[PDB]
């Protein structure tokens, strides 16, 4: 199965500042050029929330401070400004193939 | 709206089986792939499987097998995931998750809120 790694495992910003982290997918997860990876945000105690899919398309409601670029197998989020409401696990999945899997995360942390 | 409603927190001992509920309302769950996503205590999402619930047809990662069945039941729009001989590998959250065309076409946008089973004496 596609194995993605996320990196790094946690991230401390700044109200206010860029955060980024990476996902990694040791082999390709594109579909005719798209990417089939996803990235969701998991607030304490909730469950998973969407925030892009297909690498870099926003679902509604999303903030335009979120965004995604990548295909193949290495892809970005980028939260600008980083806002206390983004205190959060963050995870890739690719949908590519199944078995669906999922990156380990990156917790962001704000000091 | 969209919702999945998933049956409460259980604490059950060793070697019980636990069967948990997932209730969608605001789409029909025949027309979606019913996922189920496991989450152990500081843990990752590990998918489990999915049900078809138009034909009952379900999928499980090997490691799965023997210790989780999906299930469906169309007449009151509800997918099931029963775990049995439970151990405390076991201990995690369990989440839903619908994946089809006309509900949820691209990924998972619509996620239950977690059903989590406790394994100890």
């Known amino acids: 199965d596609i194995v993605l790694t996320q990196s790094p495992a946690s991230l401390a910003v700044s109200l206010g500042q860029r955060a980024t982290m990476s996902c990694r997918a040791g082999?390709?997860?594109?579909?005719?050029?798209?990417?089939?990876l996803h990235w969701y945000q998991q607030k304490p105690g909730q469950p998973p929330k969407l925030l892009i899919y297909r690498a870099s398309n926003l679902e509604s409601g999303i903030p335009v401070r979120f965004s995604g670029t990548g295909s193949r197998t290495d892809f970005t989020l980028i939260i600008d400004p980083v806002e206390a409401d983004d205190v959060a696990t963050y995870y890739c999945?690719?949908?590519?193939?199944?078995?669906?899997?999922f990156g380990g995360g990156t917790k962001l942390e704000i000091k | 709206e969209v919702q999945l409603q998933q049956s409460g927190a259980e604490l059950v001992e060793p070697g019980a089986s636990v069967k948990l509920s997932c209730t969608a309302s605001?789409?029909?769950?025949?027309?979606?792939?019913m996922h189920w996503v496991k989450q152990r205590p500081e843990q990752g999402l590990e998918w489990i499987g999915r049900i078809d619930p138009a034909n009952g047809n379900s999928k499980y990662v090997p490691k799965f097998q023997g210790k989780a069945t999906i299930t469906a039941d169309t007449s009151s729009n509800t997918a099931y995931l029963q775990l049995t001989s439970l151990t405390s590998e076991d201990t995690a959250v369990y989440y839903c998750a619908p994946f089809g065309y006309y509900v949820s076409d691209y990924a998972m946008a619509y996620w239950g809120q977690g059903t989590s089973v406790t394994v100890s004496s």
């Open positions: 999945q690719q949908t590519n193939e199944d078995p669906y899997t």
């Open positions: 082999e390709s997860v594109d579909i005719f050029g798209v990417g089939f």
């Open positions: 605001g789409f029909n769950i025949k027309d979606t792939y």
